[PDB]
Symmetry: C2
């Protein structure tokens, strides 16, 4: 069935799917959640939109599929490891009326010697602010 | 892994350790706009070998959350093409460990200002 198919493999259809239910996946802290077809980007991380507290990344297909998206590894290659997240980013702490927040900012350079560089630019352009085009 | 092997990973995928420390993997800490500012001398020297690394890493985002929560941009400059990101991760102020989490994060934020 649909829940047996992951990005790199399909399970035995007689087995239980190893995808987490939305009920279980939602018990993780927001930053540790993993979106899949069973627990989509909106469920895990909220709507895409223009406000500073909303994410802006992902077209309709990526939003619905999360890490099941056909090109997920080509996006995830730019996400930082935990060591790199705290190593590369400017980290701050803000206390606001909405709570206490760990802020992060940074920039990650694409490798222009990577043979896929041009396709990486096209793929990122397809998802950055993609919600502006949604019907 | 040796520094020579660990350094072959893309910067965003590197894992700092005692053999390939935070400065080697991610550059010197400092105040500039895209320069990292996090880590005291102990964390800089030890990276993920730092004994309290799990209490820091609990706040690092999965790849899915990084792209789900953050505001992402792309800039083309004379140095290359850069994926920019900003965001914020909410601490659970109801967690009984909240006060200690704040202490641990503050101990590393801008710690470099106190040492060469």
């Amino acid at each position: 069935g649909s829940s047996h198919h992951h990005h790199h493999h399909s399970q035995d259809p007689n087995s239980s799917s190893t995808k987490k239910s939305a009920a279980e996946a939602s018990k993780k802290p927001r930053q540790k959640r993993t979106a899949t077809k069973a627990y989509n980007v909106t469920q895990a991380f909220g709507r895409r939109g223009p406000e500073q507290t909303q994410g802006n990344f992902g077209d309709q297909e990526l939003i619905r599929q999360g890490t099941d998206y056909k090109h997920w590894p080509q996006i995830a290659q730019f996400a930082p490891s935990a060591s790199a997240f705290f190593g590369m980013s400017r980290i701050g702490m803000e206390v606001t009326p909405s709570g206490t927040w760990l802020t992060y900012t940074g920039a990650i350079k694409l490798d222009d010697k990577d043979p896929n560089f041009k396709d990486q630019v096209i793929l990122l352009n397809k998802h950055i602010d993609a919600y502006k085009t949604f019907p």
